Predict the structure of Glycogen phosphorylase, muscle form.
Amino acid sequence: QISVRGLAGVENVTELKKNFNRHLHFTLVKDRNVATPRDYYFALAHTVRDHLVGRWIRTQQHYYEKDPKRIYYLSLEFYMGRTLQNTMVNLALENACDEATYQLGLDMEELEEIEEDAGLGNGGLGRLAACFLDSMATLGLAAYGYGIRYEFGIFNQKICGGWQMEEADDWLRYGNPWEKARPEFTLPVHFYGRVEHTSQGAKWVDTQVVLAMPYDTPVPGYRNNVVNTMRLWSAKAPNDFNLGYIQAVLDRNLAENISRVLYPNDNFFEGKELRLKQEYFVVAATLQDIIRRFKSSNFDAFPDKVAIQLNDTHPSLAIPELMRVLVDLERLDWDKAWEVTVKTCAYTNHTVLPEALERWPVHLLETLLPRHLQIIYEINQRFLNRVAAAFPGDVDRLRRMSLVEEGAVKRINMAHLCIAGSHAVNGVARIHSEILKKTIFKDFYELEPHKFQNKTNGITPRRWLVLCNPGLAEIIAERIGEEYISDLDQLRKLLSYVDDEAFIRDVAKVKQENKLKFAAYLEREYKVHINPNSLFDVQVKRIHEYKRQLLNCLHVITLYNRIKKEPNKFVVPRTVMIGGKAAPGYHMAKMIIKLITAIGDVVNHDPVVGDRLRVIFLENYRVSLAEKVIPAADLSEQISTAGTEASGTGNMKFMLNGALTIGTMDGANVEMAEEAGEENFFIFGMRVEDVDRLDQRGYNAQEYYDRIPELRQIIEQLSSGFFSPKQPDLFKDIVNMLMHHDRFKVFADYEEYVKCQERVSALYKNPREWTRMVIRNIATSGKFSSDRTIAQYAREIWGVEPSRQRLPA
Amino acid sequence: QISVRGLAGVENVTELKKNFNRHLHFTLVKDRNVATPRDYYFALAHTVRDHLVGRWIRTQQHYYEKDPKRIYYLSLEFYMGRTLQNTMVNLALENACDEATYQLGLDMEELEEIEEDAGLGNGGLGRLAACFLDSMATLGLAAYGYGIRYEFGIFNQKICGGWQMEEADDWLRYGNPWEKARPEFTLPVHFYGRVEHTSQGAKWVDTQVVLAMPYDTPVPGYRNNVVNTMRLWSAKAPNDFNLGYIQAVLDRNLAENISRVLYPNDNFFEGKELRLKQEYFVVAATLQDIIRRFKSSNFDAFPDKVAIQLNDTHPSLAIPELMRVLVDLERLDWDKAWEVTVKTCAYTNHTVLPEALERWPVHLLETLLPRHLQIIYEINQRFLNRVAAAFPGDVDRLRRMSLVEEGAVKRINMAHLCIAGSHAVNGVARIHSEILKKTIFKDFYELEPHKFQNKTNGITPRRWLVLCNPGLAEIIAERIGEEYISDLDQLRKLLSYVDDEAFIRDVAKVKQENKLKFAAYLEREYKVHINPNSLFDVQVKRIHEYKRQLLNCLHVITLYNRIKKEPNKFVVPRTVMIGGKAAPGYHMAKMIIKLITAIGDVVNHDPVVGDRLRVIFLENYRVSLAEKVIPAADLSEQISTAGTEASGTGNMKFMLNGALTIGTMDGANVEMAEEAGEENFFIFGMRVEDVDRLDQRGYNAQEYYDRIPELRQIIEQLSSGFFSPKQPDLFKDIVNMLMHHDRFKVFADYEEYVKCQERVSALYKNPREWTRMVIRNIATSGKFSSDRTIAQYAREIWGVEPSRQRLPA
Ligand SMILES: Nc1ccn([C@@H]2O[C@H](CO)[C@@H](O)[C@H](F)[C@H]2O)c(=O)n1
Ligand SMILES: Nc1ccn([C@@H]2O[C@H](CO)[C@@H](O)[C@H](F)[C@H]2O)c(=O)n1
């Protein structure tokens, strides 16, 4: 049908059809008369999976022969989404499977909707790991993703009476055709016990053992025949476990609980024992696998053959675990082991919010990991001796830099442990990396300036353009060819088409088609009516106070109040869509969701408004939903308080897909505006410097309430029960927070935000100039490919060269 | 190699080789350079499984078209053992796979040893269900086995310091290639709640829901292209289950515990709530499936299309569950529903031991299954009204026949419920069925004589001759052809070879080969030395007081003491082998195991004994071990106290495989002796009548101790610490039981047992006459095929005709 989806050759289509029929019969044990759409999905998945295996076996054989330096990406989250279409895209199989299924009388897009998301992450950090795996394979790096195979991923969100309800995400119910269990490579992990000192060093004894069983999932590169591995560990009890009889068997559940469920917190730290066990479990099993693979090639060459990347501090225990193994088991002296560790490890920071930083109580580590606590104390003493020598007499610096925090309860600061034991530390956008050196890690930057780097985030143009927006990928390829898909900088060539009347019409046509498709999806799956001629105003991301969904709410109510004031005046019609999950225990975030649905209940049913304004809460936001709504958006809301969102990646997805951005100068928004030109972005609000000035003076929300009549009206509406007639005081917590306890200064940006939104509406009235600005955004989005990001990690941190060359098919 | 293993045609072998290579690559994702023996086992299993699928799909399609009467065999146990060889045998694939694997450079017998037993049963009752499934498929019946998919089957037994230790049987660790998950046919099961009475009948409300997910395993008939289904249910929590957040997800384990583990009791009742949940879970899910299938063809014709066979009282809740569905949900009147139920259900009793009978506390049923208790009360009232009308004024009969037992705690007698609600009740051997009508169910037999039947047990000659003893199957086929394999009565033709010198030599040759193979197995896997020229004296079965492993122990010690008395006298050398598992909480059974190993420790290390006597405890007795030791045995010990072993089936296995039997006139031993002729059996001891006479008089063990000096010596050796030097009083519990509290009258049979054993030893000295008696046993073992047993159930209980005709291939 379309060119970028590859060839549908007669031989290929014939072969796909027969293998589809073979799997339906032999694998699924069904005939065509009993088969359901789900059976058909599985037959296709097995057919496509077969095409991966030869490339998978020979990629791994190739790494064994050539023995390149190996990259290990450690993460507690891999937010993968669906796998079927992605695999077809990377293998150039999409048109062939489309033809083959068509000839069997099936609709492939309908089959694609049957696959469950692999929802093994919360949001941006988990999705970054997924984009990174795709880019590493595409760039020919010998890379392995290592994590946990959660039985339950991020919960499914239902909305009941306007409130969020959580349901278990039982994603494995029907099986997972993409994974291969590898029970033969099962490894022991130790917990509890005590430390014994012998003549020949320390010994960790009397431990409880949990087994780690690996499951391998293939990661295909884009049309290069490379297939890398993501290996996820599952917890298993040993067979003599607890071994009255019946209870001992049932108590096996206690050990296997380690891999049962993903902790559903985005940007927040909960110091629970089970979470600590998860963090050690992934680290201990992964490191044995790394060392095994290294010996099957003297530890001086260890950092020449191994790089370990820590995704946040979640796998920070890799540092003392590597020391434990080298010192206690391999009998290296401390100094040599430390040199190896530092040269092997590198650490990526993803946030500056204090509540997100991991600070583990010493009493937890004492009981659970007694040998690791000893090692951490020794690391701290030697590190602080270095600080003392560099800054003699500076006693407060010593207190500030310690890995051990004093107080009511002693804690270990895991971020300080990561900086001490890594040769590289990076932030995830230029402004964030600068904030790290200037504020929270200033003392560390002064001691070791060479460690600190920036690696601005990116997204994969395979999933986030070709897969989710084939119409746009196609009109682009018609003009500049297909090479941009793995060299996104080539989109710059599109600037010579900004005055091309044919291109302008095509770009605008693709957007309208995307909007019609999404408008139809909403009616089908959720029985809701929207106007596809309206501006699609979209804010999708996890619900948090710092992300300021509440500022969006205030704008929505302002628009409603202005309409009610002058009903017969023309306004640019809008569909305002907001979606995202709240952490189950985050009360304020749950109240914000209720507020959004409550506003919808009033606005969507007001006869005077008509179809000029609609407010929709998008339920169960997740990767597969993002792939639907992002190509349909006109306006992308990126409105965090300046200095709070480290990078953002959702922002980049919208830019690539033909939406304009309204945003603060925060995270990667700054670099996006710089690439496109500030004239082509809708920037508003305080800069970081303005926020600092306000904090120094003291933020008084009452001032704004007093001086802005439109803002006062909204607060009075909220307080009095306008949006909750039966429960007049429902939103009192929200009002109280806004008026007296707002860490994120919602009111301070309100005036400039509303004025900026007026400018957006003005441009949308002129379709031709709107679209020309869109082309200028798409054309300059090249920097934000994760291929660029990974190439920088490879060259500047891991010490390896990327390769775009094919392996033989 | 050998004829009964089928053809190894060039086309077939070529095809098997390529499909083996395909599975190794595509299914296992391995190359020949990394593959282990386990990988090779799985590639073969997948290759053989492929040959089942076409026959499986068309067998089930055939039943849908023809709509025969369907047979549902309900059991909490299916003791299946390994599946690979059995599948090859039934499909005529054994020689072809042997050739194909040979040409790939592999040894198929070595691959076969990698498969785990499916150990989903305890002993005789579970293994009977497995033999029955094989015969039903071989006889072309539309039959389904329904049970529970336990995550952990019967424990693995380790012996440490002579004591039994239990380990979890994690049989699913590496996956099960034989099953097909069917999550699309998942069904809800209800627990707890309360009963509400409305205008339109009772309603069961406020229940907790557990999901039942089916897994289907194919059951191939012998060379007839029929493949039936065994469907096993697995427990799953619903997704809104318990739905702070983390705990609710972890608490899903509570529901899923239902299918976690097999209760390890043989012939003993434990009134635990979890066991009751297991029993209801299998019944509720199975009955919905039955009704579903019946509607997809008015309940008057229900018993014409459905037969339900209850394997013991474990699934007895089928009776009130069927009433519940017909009355509460389908709105049939009571009387009509009861008629349907009675005509549909039939019940098999497997024991007369009082401690094995299921008597559930009313307070348990009240809380767990409140509607079922009400239904049971109503059944009882109507049944007792019938008893009152038939035997007016007989008030004690009313108390004795009630389904409700009075006392400290009220209980429901599940055996009484089964008789009341079934049109047929059978025992499992002629003597057992007679005991049922004369003693424990006498009152019921007087009320409804027509209900009571006998169906003597049998074993499948596929697993228990062709599979485990190909050498014997072959020498038999050389003379009478292959038709006996599914018509075992043809073995009678072998009586014309009892004087054939060629046959005599061949029968004896096969036994010696079997003994050498087993003697070698013992050294390899267990580092133990045995003399293959000795008489192999074998007692393998679960450890229980009624089975009298202790009487065997007494004989062993008698032989040892006689040798020590006259060392230079000739005795026929013996290897005495005893094996079997004890229930984890059965203290006396655990003490008996310790006694056996303790005797071995003394006897096997006495230089004066030499290799004239050896005592071996066979560890981890299970189906796969039975297939090894039974073909190797010379003497089969079947020595239960008369009237205690309902049938036995181990006895039949030994008879078919060329061992002679020493046994009491108990269970099926009586019919075996009758078939072969009493001159060809070694019968000893009290009959049932003698046991009754002794009970009436009062059993005094002291009398025997006083009058038998050899017996006194043994007791004194046990008491004084001869067999436990460091712990002199170790066996005091055993001695105390023998002397004062022996329900099974060990001493009463001791003299006759020892004398009978002398006669065995006498015959073994004359190899030619031993072997001639063996031929007379094998020749008359035909009655004990489960094909005969199933044909009798079909004709006399289920009302269906067996068919030996092939389905098209
Ligand atoms: N526990 C956390 C901490 C930070 N993050 C996010 O990580 C993304 C990837 O770097 C960034 O784009 C975002 F700026 C950041 O908020 C997250 O999703 N979970
Ligand atoms: N809970 C029970 C009760 C009885 N049985 C056995 O069942 C076998 C099959 O009928 C018989 O051959 C045996 F005689 C009997 O002991 C058993 O294994 N478990």
Remarks:
- The radius of gyration of chain B is 27 Å.
- The first strand of chain B starts at residue 70 and ends at 74.
- Residues B 123-125, 128, 266-267, 350-351, 356, 428, 457, 645-649, 667 surround DKZ (ligand 2) (CB under 6 Å).
- The CA atoms of residues 221 and 791 of chain B lie 14 Å apart.
